[PDB]
């Protein structure tokens, strides 16, 4: 049971603020020598939140595999003698184990979701405790995402993985201590139903030794509904709906009264209905059309570290270009992202970190498990770890009205028997963990309409298609034919709504061509344009998401010229020519509505 921290009977002191002591451990003696005991040797200042790889311009820190130590002292605020205090890590990429002054208090696997522990017994209010963090950036076959650690003859660990983006690690987001009353709200769940768009209710179901009443206050803070019951309610309402263009928010505030002290938790709600009918995706009983991007949490110097200016600027760009939706590509994003999405009515495809369950999308000319689904590779523990990743993503983003669909994985290889054996239970478990949202699994190119094995276990079909790029390279005529043929094949086979969640081409900013050859800005424009002409001719396609909003870092190889260049913007957010192409189509269309051509 987890909620995002906020105010009044609750209060934060964040240690996000500032520089920590940081150290490597090339021989992994930190645990043996109990480094959490003393203040570190060999410590250098590092900034949190932020990846550790790019911060020191050193290829050895950058390419490190192992454990790293983050440590900082802090003064525990003194008006906190009688309240309950928690230590919350909003993300520690891959694995983290924390000591609060010689006392292990938490441990976590999963680099993208928050994890907290009550630390009341282990701290002296009014004085300073020392926080030590042990961070592991290693991936094996039971981590979400999977990878393999390669140890050379000399014990240097080098991490290989099967996804594009670079394996940035560290404390990527918020680290804070926050206090709730000893009687406190611990979890909230809100569900919205709507009929003729002027007439429904907000079911609730709450959970910590406190009798609870909930007021549903206005944007004007005018109250229009009231309930009581730990097992919640159905507050019935005639309302203004949370819509894609505007995203209205009521405020449902839950009051947890114990007979002495009280706690109250403010939770914003968007009144909207999501469903799939035939080949139509409907938000509030109207067929929506998705436009926008796959994104990444990547940026210069800070890696995957959260940054407010970046969020403000990237939403300004996305707003300008006319995007209405995005997918949290290949891991759960910072919650600040989803909060922004709620206030602005941005439609979001929420996705777990389950990427790389595929051993066919390689560079060439170089020792893998020859069976993807097996005891050596993706096995039962992997499945359990995956289900737990689904449970953490859902427990954190269930109430967000902007999250409109759950993505279980991205681009697994579905051809082997055992893909369906691995995925079907996860598809079912996910539906039972949130029956109010449709479910998806993003589908790779070579698992075509004929060969794919699991897409009928999901509500929406999300395709990643690169005809004319990785195959039929340079050939816009042939690729157009292939793309039309496979889209009609998919619509014939499943009669589900189709979103093209990935389509894009590597483009060097400033490379121009009078031909329309690959890597050129002219080719990025003509290729996106040919895709758009096809989408507009297939009734089932309800959504387009250009593969990347910006250029991002990847591991080194012959396929990646300083990373992935499929961005519409450069890594410093400057637009390639295709940006204006996109802006013309996406602002020239009626909002949320499929282009009539």
Q: What is the 3-state secondary structure (H, E, C) of 471-502?
A: ECCCCHHHHHHHHHHHHHHHHHHHCCCEEEEE
Minimum distance between the CB of residue 203 and ligand E8X, rounded to whole angstroms? 36
Catalytic residue among 116, 279, 480, 502: 502
Q: Which two tokens stand for residue 127?
A: 């004085």
Nearer to its own copies by Cβ, of 245 and 515: the residue is 515
Q: Which two tokens stand for residue 215?
A: 């007021």
Residue from 220, 366, 432, 590 touching its own copies (CB under 8 A): that is 366
Cβ-based neighbours of 597, under 8 Å, separated by 6 or more? 533, 536, 537
* Residue 258: Cβ-neighbour burial (10 angstroms; 0-12, 13-18, 19+): middle
Asked if 556 touches its own copies (CB under 8 A), the answer is yes
Cβ-based neighbours of 61, under 8 Å, separated by 6 or more? 24, 52, 53, 55
Asked if 407 touches ligand E8X (CB under 6 A), the answer is no
Residue from 519, 530, 539, 570 touching its own copies (CB under 8 A): that is 519
Residue from 19, 371, 562, 584 touching its own copies (CB under 8 A): that is 562
Q: How far apart are CA 131 and CA 284, in angstroms?
A: 47
515-551: burial string, b at 16+ Cβ within 10 Å, e else: eeebebbbbbbbbbebbbebbeebebbbbbbbbbbbb
116 part of the active site: no
Catalytic residue among 279, 297, 411, 544: 411
411 part of the active site: yes
Q: Which does 444 bind (CB under 5 to 8 A by kind): its own copies, ligand E8X, none?
A: ligand E8X
Minimum distance between the CB of residue 367 and its own copies, rounded to whole angstroms? 12
Asked if 470 touches ligand E8X (CB under 6 A), the answer is yes
Asked if 446 touches ligand E8X (CB under 6 A), the answer is yes
Choose one: 34-42, 213-221, 554-562, 570-578; the region binding its own copies (CB under 8 A).
554-562
| Alpha helix ranges (H) inside 351-475 | 380-397, 419-433
Site string for its own copies, 470-509 (x = CB under 8 A): xx-xxx--x---------------------------x-x-
Q: How far apart are CA 408 and CA 349, in angstroms?
A: 10
Choose one: 184-192, 205-213, 225-233, 464-472; the region binding ligand E8X (CB under 6 A).
464-472
Q: How far apart are CA 449 and CA 125, in angstroms?
A: 61
Q: Which does 564 bind (CB under 5 to 8 A by kind): its own copies, ligand E8X, none?
A: ligand E8X
Residue from 42, 362, 456, 495 touching its own copies (CB under 8 A): that is 362
Nearer to ligand E8X by Cβ, of 250 and 547: the residue is 547
Q: Are 389 and 433 in contact (CB under 8 A)?
A: no
Q: How far apart are CA 546 and CA 498, in angstroms?
A: 14
Q: What are phi and psi of 544, to 5 degrees?
A: -125, 125
Asked if 559 touches its own copies (CB under 8 A), the answer is yes
Binding residues vs ligand E8X (CB under 6 A)? 163-164, 330, 361, 365, 411, 444-446, 464, 466, 470, 502, 564, 566
Binding residues vs its own copies (CB under 8 A)? 57-59, 62, 152, 158, 361-366, 446, 469-471, 473-475, 478, 506, 508, 511, 513-520, 556-562
Catalytic residue numbers, as ranges = 411, 502
């Amino acid at each position: 049971h987890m909620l995002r921290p906020v105010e009044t009977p609750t209060r934060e002191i964040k240690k996000l603020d500032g520089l920590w002591a940081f150290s490597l451990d090339r021989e992994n003696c930190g645990i043996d020598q109990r480094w959490w005991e003393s203040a570190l040797q060999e410590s250098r200042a590092i900034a949190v939140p932020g990846s550790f790889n790019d911060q020191f311009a050193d290829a050895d820190i950058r390419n490190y595999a192992g454990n790293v130590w983050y440590q900082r002292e802090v003064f525990i605020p003194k008006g906190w003698a009688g309240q309950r205090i928690v230590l919350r890590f909003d993300a520690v990429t891959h694995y983290g184990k924390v000591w609060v002054n010689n006392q292990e208090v938490m441990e976590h696997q999963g680099g993208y979701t928050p994890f907290e522990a009550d630390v009341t017994p282990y701290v002296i209010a009014g004085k300073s405790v020392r926080i030590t963090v042990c961070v592991n950036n290693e991936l094996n076959w039971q981590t979400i995402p999977p990878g393999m650690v390669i140890t050379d003859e000399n014990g240097k660990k080098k991490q290989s993985y099967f996804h594009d983006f670079f394996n940035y690690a560290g404390i990527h987001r918020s680290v804070m201590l926050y206090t709730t009353p000893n009687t406190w709200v611990d979890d909230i769940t809100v569900v919205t139903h709507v009929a003729q768009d002027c007439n429904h209710a907000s079911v609730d179901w709450q959970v910590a030794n406190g009798d609870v009443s909930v007021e549903l206050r206005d944007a004007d803070q005018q109250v229009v509904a009231t309930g009581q019951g730990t097992s919640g309610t159905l507050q019935v309402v005639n309302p203004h709906l949370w819509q894609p263009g505007e995203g209205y928010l009521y405020e449902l505030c839950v009051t947890a009264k114990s007979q002495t002290e009280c706690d109250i938790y403010p939770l914003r709600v968007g009144i909207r209905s999501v469903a799939v009918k035939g080949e139509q995706f409907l938000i509030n009983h109207k067929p929506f059309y998705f436009t926008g991007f796959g994104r990444h949490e990547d940026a210069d110097l800070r890696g995957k570290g959260f940054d407010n200016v970046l969020m403000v600027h990237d939403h300004a760009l996305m707003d300008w270009i006319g995007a209405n939706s995005y997918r949290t590509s290949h891991y759960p994003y910072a919650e600040e992202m989803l909060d922004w999405a709620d206030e602005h009515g941005i439609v979001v495809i929420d996705e777990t970190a389950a990427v790389g369950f595929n051993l066919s999308l390689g560079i060439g000319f170089e020792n893998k498990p020859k069976e993807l689904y097996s005891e050596e590779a993706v096995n039962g523990e992997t499945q359990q770890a995956h289900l737990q990743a689904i449970k953490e993503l859902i427990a954190r983003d269930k109430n967000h009205p902007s999250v409109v669909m759950w993505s279980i994985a991205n681009e697994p290889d579905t051809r082997p028997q055992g893909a369906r054996e691995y995925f079907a239970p996860l598809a079912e478990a996910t539906r039972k963990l949130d029956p109010t949202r449709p479910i998806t699994c993003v589908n790779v190119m070579f698992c075509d309409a004929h060969t794919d094995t699991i897409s009928d276990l999901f509500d929406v079909l999300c395709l990643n298609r690169y005809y004319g790029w990785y195959v039929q390279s340079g050939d816009l005529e042939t690729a157009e034919k292939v793309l039309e043929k496979e889209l009609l094949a998919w619509q014939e086979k499943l009669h589900q709504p189709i979103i093209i969640t990935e389509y894009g081409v590597d483009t060097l900013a400033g490379l121009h061509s009078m031909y329309t050859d690959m890597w050129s800005e002219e080719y990025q424009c003509a290729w996106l344009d040919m895709y758009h002409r096809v989408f507009d001719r297939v009734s089932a396609v309800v959504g387009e998401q250009v593969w990347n909003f910006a250029d991002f870092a990847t591991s080194q190889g012959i396929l990646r010229v300083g990373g992935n260049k499929k961005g519409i913007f450069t890594r410093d957010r400057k637009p390639k020519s295709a940006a204006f192409l996109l802006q013309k189509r996406w602002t020239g269309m009626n909002f949320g509505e499929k282009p009539q051509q």
